[PDB]
Design a protein around this ligand. Structure first.
Ligand SMILES: CCCCCC(=O)c1c(O)c(-c2ccc(O)cc2)c[nH]c1=O
Lengths: 281, 297
């Protein structure tokens, strides 16, 4: 398999690094013959894994998951590590973190949050039914197309630990919880924190040292929204996502049936406003 | 050419290679504009708000002279962009790669016992210089220890005093890689607040010596989240093999005292027989020189 992946030369070229580090070596690439854009993840190969591809092949075809196109291996000196290119759907509008970052008052209107949270839960549902936990839901992994469509990137379940602010309490080992549990509901916690991140512009504990946030998440009560302006429905949704003990955290299906997620008599108008916002920048 | 301000790099430093590997802390080859000499330049795109954070911590920097075992930090620069600017951190160029590269390009990924003592000593000497000047290096590891073609051993310093490459940019929120971390830097049940100390560098140096001996630090074989949990709760890690000398084991035991309050200083560790007594010093220096030559073909 791996040994049958062609050189990308003449097929995809790299344009530039996107996300300025949040994803590692992920480039905006273009399909040479057509000029269509693609995001390309570039890794030195030394690690039959090689199974990241099989995941992306089976599980990316859902509309809320960025589509896997294909893989290439670039011939490198005697002499030097070969590079593997993973080529994915390009999501032009960018991350939902960036959206809130660029909005005035670093906050999104509540029905934008309902729309987006639902899209994330839909992508997550697709992964969970196929027994896959994303394990790193956060606004930086939730992407937007020009079409104002919502797509999850960067899943699977390495040597560096990323940002801790969206991690569920249970996935953080401690004296009482020695073997740090990843359960599909962990993603639901992360989704709730992503909802707070959309409402306030940053996750709870954003002002802590990452290490101190890691210490605190399992020891703290569930985070709550700072302002009081939000609807009872949103408070309740956030509350559902952030059930401290995952054993009583609602399932993905249940949260999708939560009133805040289910009753959206503004989808059409909301989807148009996001379109409007994306273009205005 | 001052370390106490951030200026336009125009006429002082410039890049020699194209920036196509990213601008979030990637290092590129560069040039002192007046002299023509080589320079390693770390490049980071930076928001205006991060530029202010930058000025603040530039004031936080402490003064320390050049040293044979520290790749000289030359200062901090910002280059503007179509009115996100770039942060540049400039450092002495070391052509012959890192110690991680040294172990990787070695038969069976294991340095022999006298190479270890020599490199470890060089690391320790550079640290002593940092420590007498009240600065903690904070990231001692194989990858952060460099070789020149003269086989000189030098620590990476992109402004370690105020951690400029660490505090700014899209991944400054990342926990990082846990394996070289001293127990006291990890927040846990008995350690609610990370306490960085000079002696934290010495734990990392002990983990670095195991990295030279085995090609990888302890706990390499498990999820970094799990290793992070384990470092404060495990007894001090040890060398796997029994081949190593009684002096090497003792040195590893010297560095890897779990309670930093009772770990030796850098000076005390410089006097450790494994570091102090190097009969074959001259011989390994050339052995290293040899290795670097062969590797570039
Ligand atoms: C123009 C600004 C939009 C950036 C697009 C972007 O960041 C994109 C990605 O980072 C990824 C992405 C792909 C694989 C991965 O492991 C992590 C991220 C996919 N598609 C994108 O579109």
């Amino acid at each position: 398999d791996l040994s049958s992946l062609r050189d990308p030369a003449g097929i995809f070229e790299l344009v530039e690094v996107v996300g300025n580090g949040t994803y590692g070596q992920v480039y905006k690439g273009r399909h040479v013959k057509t000029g269509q854009l693609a995001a390309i993840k570039v890794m030195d190969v030394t690690e039959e894994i090689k199974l990241e591809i099989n995941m992306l092949k089976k599980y990316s075809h859902h509309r809320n998951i960025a589509t896997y196109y294909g893989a290439f291996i670039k011939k490198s000196p005697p002499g030097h590590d070969d590079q593997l290119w993973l080529v994915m759907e390009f999501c032009g509008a960018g991350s939902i973190t960036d959206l809130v970052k660029n909005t005035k008052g670093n906050t999104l209107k509540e029905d934008w949050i309902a729309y987006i949270s639902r899209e994330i839960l839909r992508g997550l549902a697709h992964l969970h039914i196929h027994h896959v936990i994303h394990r790193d839901i956060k606004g930086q992994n939730v992407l937007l197309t020009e079409n104002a469509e919502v797509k999850l990137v960067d899943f699977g379940v390495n040597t560096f630990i990323g940002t801790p602010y969206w991690m569920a309490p249970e996935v953080i080992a401690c004296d009482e919880n020695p073997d740090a549990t990843y359960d599909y509901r962990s993603d639901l916690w992360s989704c709730g924190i992503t909802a707070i991140e959309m409402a306030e512009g940053a996750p709870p504990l954003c002002d802590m040292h990452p290490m101190r946030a890691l210490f605190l998440i399992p020891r703290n009560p569930p985070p709550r929204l700072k302002s009081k302006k939000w609807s009872k429905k949103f408070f309740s949704f956030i509350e559902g996502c952030l059930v401290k003990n995952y054993m009583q955290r609602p399932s993905t299906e249940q949260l999708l049936k939560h009133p805040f997620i289910r009753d959206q008599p503004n989808e059409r108008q909301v989807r148009i406003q996001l379109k409007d916002h994306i273009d205005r920048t």
